[PDB]
Amino acid sequence: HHHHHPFRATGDGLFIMNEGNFQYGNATLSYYDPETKKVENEIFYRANAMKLGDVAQSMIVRDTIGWVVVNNSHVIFAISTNTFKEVGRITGLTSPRYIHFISDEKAYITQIWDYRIFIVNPKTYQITGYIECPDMTMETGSTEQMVQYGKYVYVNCWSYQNRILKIDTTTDKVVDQLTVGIQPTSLVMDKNFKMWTITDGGYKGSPYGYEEPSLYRIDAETFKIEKQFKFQLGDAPSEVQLNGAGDELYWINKDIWRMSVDEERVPVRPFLKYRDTKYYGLTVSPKNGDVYVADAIDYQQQGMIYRYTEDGELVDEFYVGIIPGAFCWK
Ligand code: CNC
């Protein structure tokens, strides 16, 4: 007829969630093919004729449907992973963080500025319940990333909290907790069924705290801490990630750092050196073993991704949205 055929996502590509400026409404989604090395920006806007919203935080792909969590627009959009077109949405979310699917019929949505985890039925798009976290307020509340062991979801508590919680999905109740250093940022489960989390500093002039941050290996069966790796005061680490095998752990602390999940010690040498910039998100390809590093670079201008081989040679670098912070494989 007339207009050029719409953009489609063929193949085993990569969504990049760009946070945008908080309060400025300029969050965007990007898509990248590793084979083609072509990035498409603003795919949500261009597909739906509608701005993504305000702090685009995270994403999960589930049977060709992508669940994109817009933290500060109080929403999660279901999109086609082929078309990027909205197929449905979940609204009325305090300030969502991450979504974890127990089943098709039930998922948990963590929140900041709330003491509850929301329970939804993804097939109806409806809230089904709430999970009251102990010793938590609406004023300082924070749930974040999740992993499942058996019948249990574990979840780290970040902004002005110092805990990992343990939830029985049979009852949807918190049944156990573990205190760690302040503001654990992230959580992953390795091939040995050990969780890893890394704290940030707090910040200079926090009313909650400012201490030395730490990486923790934790057994999933027994919920006990096995190691701790303490770093410098004024470090502010973030975004722990695993490779596809779950035997190589990576995190951000000025540089990108890498450690085999086996072995008792933090390597001397990073995976990738500091650049007087703000490395901010991170992922590993489950096909290639390749490492993508999201640079926010000053948090103002258009950000960049940097792609490296498992063995540390630069493959590609490409411009995305403002403050890229998270990835999701298709
Ligand atoms: C830098 C930064 C960022 N932060 Co802070 C983080 N960590 N933050 C910080 C640091 C600021 C040090 C500094 N001034 O450089 C740091 C660690 C101290 C901080 C503090 C906080 N932050 C916090 C959070 C949760 C967030 N932060 C982001 C704004 C989050 C950003 C991510 C994002 N997508 O925006 C972020 C990575 C980039 C913001 C920025 O510097 N923009 C550059 C430039 C454009 O500045 P801007 O327009 O004026 O932005 C200002 C604000 O963002 C302010 N600010 C920073 N964080 C917050 C948080 C809140 C709640 C408010 C009202 C303002 C801020 O600092 C900037 C001053 O110019 C956030 C979007 C990150 C995320 N995606 O989860 C998220 C807020 C989302 C929400 N719904 O609340 C803390 C609650 C974390 C904590 N418990 O320690 C805390 C709040 C303290 C406060 N209100 O003063």
Author numbering: 26 to 355
Please give sentences taken from the publication describing this entry.
Contrasting with Enterobacteria, members of the dominant genus Bacteroides often encode several BtuB vitamin B12 outer membrane transporters together with a conserved array of surface-exposed B12-binding lipoproteins. Here we show that the BtuB transporters from Bacteroides thetaiotaomicron form stable, pedal bin-like complexes with surface-exposed BtuG lipoprotein lids, which bind B12 with high affinities. Closing of the BtuG lid following B12 capture causes destabilisation of the bound B12 by a conserved BtuB extracellular loop, causing translocation of the vitamin to BtuB and subsequent transport.
To compare CNCbl binding to BtuB3G3 and BtuG3 alone, we also determined the crystal structure of BtuB3-CNCbl to a resolution of 2.6 Å. Thus, we conclude that CNCbl binding by BtuG2 and BtuG3 is the same.
